[PDB]
């Protein structure tokens, strides 16, 4: 009984959360794993990739990235690469009260989305060639990606990787929301993102 309200709150949040993240930078096909969810299978982990789409570049156009010192680094030329990964989100599962925990979580997530470096790139792209895109993925599946610039490619060679608890290379950063404690497990949202997004096309 209760157990069905709880699951519906949960599944609805996943849906709202994914919608927020995507609308900030068809979707129905990709949301099928969470829109067609019953108890009969686990609620799959929800993966969101945010990238810089390079489809519309001509062969002579160079992508550069400026570092925090405002110095340029080459990234790629024309159509060699299809996209540059910028963020990867993961939303996963391990009363009126769980309802309130999710309202709080949602507003917090609205604020966090607006603060990331890719939002600063979005701002500059839509101030009144290349666009931002997102893609939702079922994260219990591996995926290969032939000819894009992955999150793993640091582009700025001044970064020096050191041992740390997030296990990320130094050009990347990670944020995690406090988990929401629930009887079915913990609701955990995290995002890994490229620190620098001051990209230029010439």
């Amino acid at each position: 009984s209760l157990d069905k309200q709880l699951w519906e709150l949960i599944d609805n949040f996943f849906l709202k959360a994914a919608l927020l993240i995507c609308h900030s930078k068809k979707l129905e096909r990709e949301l099928k794993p969470w829109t067609t969810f019953d108890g009969s299978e686990s609620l799959p982990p929800l993966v969101i990739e945010t990238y810089l789409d390079l489809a519309r570049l001509s062969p002579s156009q160079q992508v550069t990235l400026k570092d925090q010192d405002g110095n340029p680094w080459n990234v790629c030329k024309g159509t060699k690469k299809s996209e540059i990964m910028l963020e990867r989100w993961l939303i996963q599962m391990d009363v009126s009260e769980l309802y309130r925990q999710l309202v709080l979580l949602f507003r917090y997530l609205e604020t966090l989305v607006g603060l990331l470096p890719a939002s600063e790139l979005q701002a500059r792209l839509i101030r009144p060639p290349v666009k931002l895109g997102t893609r939702i993925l079922d994260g219990s599946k591996p995926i290969v990606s032939k000819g894009r610039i992955g999150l793993s490619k640091s582009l700025i060679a001044t970064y020096s990787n050191v041992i740390n608890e997030t296990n990320l290379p130094a050009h990347l950063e990670q944020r995690k929301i406090t988990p929401i404690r629930t009887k079915f497990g913990s609701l955990r949202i995290s995002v890994s993102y490229r620190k620098d997004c001051d990209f230029h096309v010439n």
Side-chain angles (χ1 to χ4, degrees), residues 130-190:
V130 299
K131 55 177 175 174
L132 260 37
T134 51
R135 165 178 347 233
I136 293 168
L137 296 172
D138 178 329
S140 62
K141 304 193 213 314
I143 266 143
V144 204
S145 34
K146 320 191 194 193
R148 70 169 178 194
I149 302 287
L151 276 193
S152 73
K153 276 281 87 144
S154 64
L155 290 165
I156 297 169
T158 56
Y159 275 113
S160 219
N161 299 341
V162 295
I163 295 289
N164 71 97
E165 57 298 344
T166 66
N167 303 105
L168 294 169
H171 68 291
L172 295 178
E173 187 102 40
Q174 186 183 60
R175 290 292 129 91
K176 292 185 183 121
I177 317 205
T178 314
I180 292 187
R181 259 75 222 200
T182 220
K183 59 187 58 211
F184 320 107
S186 290
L187 210 195
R188 296 182 187 288
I189 299 161
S190 63

Side-chain angles (χ1 to χ4, degrees), residues 33-44:
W34 300 274
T35 56
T36 66
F37 166 77
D38 318 333
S40 72
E41 298 189 286
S42 273
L43 228 200

